[PDB]
Amino acid sequence: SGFRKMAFPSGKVEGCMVQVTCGTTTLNGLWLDDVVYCPRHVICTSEDMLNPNYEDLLIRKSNHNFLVQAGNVQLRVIGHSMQNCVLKLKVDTANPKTPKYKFVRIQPGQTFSVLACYNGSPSGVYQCAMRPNFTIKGSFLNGSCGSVGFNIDYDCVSFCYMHHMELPTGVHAGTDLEGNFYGPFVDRQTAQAAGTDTTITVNVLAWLYAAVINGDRWFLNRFTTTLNDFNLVAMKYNYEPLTQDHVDILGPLSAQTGIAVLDMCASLKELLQNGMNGRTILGSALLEDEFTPFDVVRQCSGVTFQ
Amino acid sequence: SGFRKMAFPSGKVEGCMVQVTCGTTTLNGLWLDDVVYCPRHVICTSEDMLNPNYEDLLIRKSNHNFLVQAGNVQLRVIGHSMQNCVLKLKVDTANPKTPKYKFVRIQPGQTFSVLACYNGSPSGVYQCAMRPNFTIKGSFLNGSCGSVGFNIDYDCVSFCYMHHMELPTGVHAGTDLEGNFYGPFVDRQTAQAAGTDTTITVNVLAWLYAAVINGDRWFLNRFTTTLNDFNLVAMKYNYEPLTQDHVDILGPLSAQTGIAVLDMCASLKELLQNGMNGRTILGSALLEDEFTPFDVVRQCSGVTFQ
Numbered sequence: 292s293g294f295r296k297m298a299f300p301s302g303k304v305e306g307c308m309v310q311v312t313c314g315t316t317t318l319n320g321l322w323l324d325d326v327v328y329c330p331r332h333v334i335c336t337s338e339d340m341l342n343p344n345y346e347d348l349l350i351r352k353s354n355h356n357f358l359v360q361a362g363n364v365q366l367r368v369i370g371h372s373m374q375n376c377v378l379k380l381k382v383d384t385a386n387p388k389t390p391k392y393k394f395v396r397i398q399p400g401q402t403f404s405v406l407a408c409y410n411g412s413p414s415g416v417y418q419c420a421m422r423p424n425f426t427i428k429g430s431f432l433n434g435s436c437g438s439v440g441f442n443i444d445y446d447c448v449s450f451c452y453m454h455h456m457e458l459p460t461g462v463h464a465g466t467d468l469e470g471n472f473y474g475p476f477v478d479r480q481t482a483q484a485a486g487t488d489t490t491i492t493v494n495v496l497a498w499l500y501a502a503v504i505n506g507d508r509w510f511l512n513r514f515t516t517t518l519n520d521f522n523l524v525a526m527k528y529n530y531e532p533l534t535q536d537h538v539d540i541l542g543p544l545s546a547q548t549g550i551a552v553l554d555m556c557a558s559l560k561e562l563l564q565n566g567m568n569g570r571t572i573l574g575s576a577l578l579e580d581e582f583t584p585f586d587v588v589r590q591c592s593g594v595t596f597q
Numbered sequence: 598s599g600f601r602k603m604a605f606p607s608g609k610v611e612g613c614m615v616q617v618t619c620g621t622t623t624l625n626g627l628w629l630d631d632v633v634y635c636p637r638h639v640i641c642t643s644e645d646m647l648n649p650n651y652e653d654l655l656i657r658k659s660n661h662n663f664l665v666q667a668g669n670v671q672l673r674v675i676g677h678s679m680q681n682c683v684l685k686l687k688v689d690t691a692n693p694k695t696p697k698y699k700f701v702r703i704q705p706g707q708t709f710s711v712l713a714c715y716n717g718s719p720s721g722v723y724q725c726a727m728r729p730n731f732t733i734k735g736s737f738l739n740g741s742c743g744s745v746g747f748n749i750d751y752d753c754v755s756f757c758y759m760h761h762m763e764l765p766t767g768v769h770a771g772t773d774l775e776g777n778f779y780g781p782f783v784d785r786q787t788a789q790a791a792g793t794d795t796t797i798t799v800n801v802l803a804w805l806y807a808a809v810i811n812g813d814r815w816f817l818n819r820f821t822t823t824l825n826d827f828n829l830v831a832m833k834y835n836y837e838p839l840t841q842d843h844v845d846i847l848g849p850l851s852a853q854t855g856i857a858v859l860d861m862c863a864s865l866k867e868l869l870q871n872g873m874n875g876r877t878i879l880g881s882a883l884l885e886d887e888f889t890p891f892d893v894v895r896q897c898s899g900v901t902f903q
C-alpha cells in the first residue's frame with residue numbers, strides 16, 4: 292500500500308535526448324530514427340525573440356549552422372524543415388536506442404511524466420497534469436526547452452509534450468510533438484498570460500478512492516446526492532462539471548471500494564463546504580486533482596512496463 | 598522556475614533490474630557485474646515466514662533452485678551466499694549495463710529515488726525521504742521486494758535502499774545494500790511497528806527557501822529569534838532540534854535569498870503557532886519536510902547527470 296505521485300521509468304526517453312546548438316542558443320532535442328525534434332526558437336537570438344518571422348529566419352539557415360551533440364558524438368545535420376513550432380533536423384545516423392513510439396496529443400485533465408533536461412542531459416523526472424487552461428505546473432529553468440513529456444504503455448512511449456516557455460505566473464507552456472501549442476500561446480515574447488483555471492473534479496474523486504483503498508476513511512459519510520445537485524456545488528467552488536462519462540470511468544474504483552460514485556460526490560461536497568478541519572488525506576491538507584482514475588488503478592494494482 | 602518533487606532519471610538502474618524466483622516466491626533482484634542482490638526472504642515459504650532460521654534454510658538450497666530472469670534471457674546461478682538480510686547470487690554473466698556505482702548507507706532526513714518494480718520490470722519512479730524513525734513513506738505492493746532506492750552523482754549510482762516489507766501503519770522498511778536494516782526491524786512476520794516520528798526541521802527551512810526563490814513570500818516577517826528560542830518551539834511541535842551545522846548547510850540558500858537563517862526560523866515559528874490561515878506554500882497546505890537543502894539547490898539551479 293501507499294500512494295505517491297509517480298513518474299514512468301525514464302530510461303527509454305533518456306536515450307533519445309540530445310543537445311542542439313544554433314548560434315547563441317542551446318536547448319534540448321529528441322532524437323528518433325534519423326530526425327532530431329526541437330523547439331523552433333533555437334534559430335532565434337535575443338532580439339529576434341520580440342516578434343520574429345521564423346520562415347524568414349529559417350531560409351537564412353544552413354545545415355552546418357545546427358550543432359547536434361549526442362553525448363560526446365557529434366551529429367551531422369543533412370536537412371532541416373519546420374513543422375509548426377518545432378524543427379525537424381534530419382541527421383545522418385538513426386538513433387539505435389529508438390523505442391517504439393507514438394506522437395499523441397493529450398486532453399486537459401490527463402497526466403504525463405516530464406524528463407527535465409539541460410544541455411541534452413537528463414536532470415530529473417516528475418509527473419504533471421495538463422491543466423484545464425492548457426498550462427502545466429512544472430519545474431523548468433533556462434536551457435530546459437525541448438524537454439519532453441510522455442506516457443509509457445507496455446513498451447511504447449507516447450510523447451505528448453515538448454517544453455517551450457514559462458508564463459508570468461510561473462506555469463509552463465509547450466506544444467505537442469507535431470509543434471502545435473497546447474492552449475492560446477505563441478512562441479514569442481509578448482504579454483501572454485495563463486487565464487483562469489479550474490479544478491479537475493473527476494481526478495479529485497479518483498484520489499478520494501485512492502485514499503479509501505489506502506485506509507483513509509474519515510471523510511466518508513452516509514449521505515448521497517444527485518449528479519445535478521453535486522454540479523451546482525462544483526460550479527460554486529470552481530470545480531469543473533462532472534459528466535456521466537466521468538461517473539462511468541470511476542466505476543471500477545467504485546466497485547473495488549463498494550462506495551457508489553454519487554456517494555463519494557456527497558463526501559466531496561462536504562469537504563468543499565466544511566474544509567478538512569485540520570485533517571489530511573494521503574498526506575495532503577488539500578484536495579488533490581493531478582491523479583487520473585487510470586493513475587489510481589495503475590498504482591493501486593501494480594502495472595509495469597517492458 | 599517552479600518546484601516539484603523530482604526523482605533522478607532511472608535509466609541506469611532499470612538496466613540492472615531482474616526477476617528472482619525460488620519456489621513459490623517471486624521478487625526483484627539487482628544485477629551488478631556477475632552478482633544478483635535480492636532480499637533473503639525469497640528462500641522462504643508462507644509458513645517459513647513466521648519465525649525462520651535463514652542459515653538452516655539456505656544450506657538446504659541448491660544453485661538450480663534460483664531462477665533468475667533478465668528480461669527474456671535466463672540467468673544461470675553458479676554460487677550463492679547470504680550477507681545479513683540480502684542474498685548474493687553469483688551468475689555466469691556480468692551485466693553489460695553495470696553503471697559505475699557505490700553502496701552507501703543514508704542518514705534519516707536524506708532523500709533518494711525509488712524505482713518500483715514487479716517481476717523484474719520497472720513500474721514507476723518517485724522520491725522518498727528516510728524518516729527519523731527509519732521508515733519510508735513509499736508505494737509498494739506484493740512483489741515489489743528487491744526494488745531499490747538510489748541517488749545519482751554525475752555518472753555514479755549510489756544505491757542506498759532495498760525494499761523488504763510494509764509495517765502496520767502503511768509505511769515501509771528495508772535494508773541498505775549490504776543487507777543491514779534501517780531501524781529496529783527484522784525480516785520476519787512479527788508484531789513490529791514504526792514507533793514515533795518527528796518532522797525534519799532543516800528540510801522544512803530548505804523548502805521555505807525554495808518557496809522564496811519561486812516567489813512565495815507571504816510567510817516572511819521582520820522578526821528574528823535565537824537558535825535556542827527556536828528550538829523550544831521546535832520541541833513543542835515535535836520538530837527535531839536545529840543544530841549549528843544545519844544553519845551552516847542552509848548558508849547558501851540564505852545568501853541567495855538575503856534571508857538570514859534565524860529569520861526564516863522566526864517565520865517557521867509563526868507558521869507553527871498560527872498555521873497558514875487558508876494559504877499555501879508551493880502548492881501545499883502543509884509544511885513539507887522531504888526536500889533537503891541539496892535537493893533545493895539542485896532543482897533551483899539545474900544540475901544534470903551523465
Ligand SMILES: *[C@H](O)[C@H](C[C@@H]1CCNC1=O)NC(=O)[C@H](CC(C)(C)C)NC(=O)OCc1ccccc1
Pocket residue numbers: 318332335340431432433434435436437455456457458463478479480598
Ligand atoms: C527555453 O529553454 C526557455 C524555457 C524557459 C526559461 C525559464 N523557464 C522556462 O520554462 N524558454 C524561453 O526562454 C522562452 C523563449 C521564447 C519566448 C519561446 C522564444 N521565453 C520565456 O519562457 O520567457 C519567460 C521567462 C524566461 C526566463 C525566466 C523566466 C521566465
Ligand SMILES: *[C@H](O)[C@H](C[C@@H]1CCNC1=O)NC(=O)[C@H](CC(C)(C)C)NC(=O)OCc1ccccc1
Pocket residue numbers: 292624638641646737738739740741742743761762763764769784785786
Ligand atoms: C515483498 O514483496 C513484500 C513487500 C510488501 C508487500 C506489501 N507491501 C510491501 O511492502 N514483503 C513482504 O511481504 C514481507 C515479507 C517478510 C516479512 C519480509 C518475510 N511481509 C510484509 O510486508 O507484511 C506486511 C504486509 C504484507 C502484505 C500486505 C500488507 C502488509
